[PDB]
Design a protein around this ligand. Structure first.
Ligand SMILES: COCCN1CCC(C(=O)NO)(S(=O)(=O)c2ccc(OCCCn3nnc(-c4ccc(OC(F)(F)F)cc4)n3)cc2)CC1
Ligand SMILES: [Ca+2]
Ligand SMILES: [Ca+2]
Ligand SMILES: [Zn+2]
Ligand SMILES: [Zn+2]
Length: 164
């Protein structure tokens, strides 16, 4: 007899990602900057490292889409669902999809791409939603303007339980 494979954590510390396409709301550079910083949230507290591929197959494929966009978990237009992501594994594992019916920003206005991406890459690395309202992995958006960013303790303990 056999059981289904997966799912736990990446068996490798050097992971790749690809920005498959881009939102109109921010420049290529601003989007690239936001995702790089979002990955740095996680590499700053684990031995993980992330490299960007410009084409082809990466561990974490990042894309923007609307409504039904190729996984039968359709987005819903402006508001509501902002994004979703899949835990470590083959094919779709690690991938992160952002709803391009939202207004994405580098500010306290609209929805901050960096912060939402940071949350989603938590999923990409194997974290489900936290019940701690102060956690990055809490499923309610409450990002504010100032000042710097610190990964809350709940998320630090969660990610470090997987990757040390
Ligand atoms: C029933 O099934 C539906 C399930 N549903 C759940 C919701 C969604 C989801 O989670 N997808 O993955 S979402 O897309 O609506 C969605 C996506 C992303 C979200 O970001 C959550 C982030 C929570 N946070 N806010 N601020 C902060 C924050 C943390 C630290 C910090 O530094 C500090 F502390 F100041 F120093 C500053 C701010 N942390 C929220 C919602 C969709 C799927
Ligand atoms: Ca939406
Ligand atoms: Ca993949
Ligand atoms: Zn999707
Ligand atoms: Zn989530």
């Amino acid at each position: 007899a056999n059981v289904f494979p997966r799912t736990l954590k990446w068996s490798k510390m050097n992971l790749t990602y690809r920005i498959v396409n881009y939102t109109p709301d921010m420049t290529h550079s601003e989007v690239e900057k936001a995702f790089k910083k979002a990955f740095k949230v996680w590499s700053d507290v684990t031995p993980l490292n992330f490299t960007r591929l410009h084409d082809g197959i990466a561990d974490i494929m990042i894309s923007f889409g609307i409504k039904e966009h190729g996984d039968f978990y359709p987005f819903d237009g402006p508001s509501g669902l902002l994004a979703h992501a899949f835990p470590p594994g083959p094919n779709y594992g690690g991938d992160a999809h952002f709803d391009d019916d939202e207004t994405w920003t580098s500010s306290s206005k609209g929805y901050n791409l960096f912060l939402v991406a940071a949350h989603e890459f938590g999923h990409s690395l194997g974290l489900d939603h936290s019940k701690d309202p102060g956690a990055l992995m809490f499923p309610i958006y409450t990002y504010t303007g100032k000042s710097h960013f610190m990964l809350p303790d709940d998320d630090v303990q969660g990610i470090q339980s997987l990757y040390g």
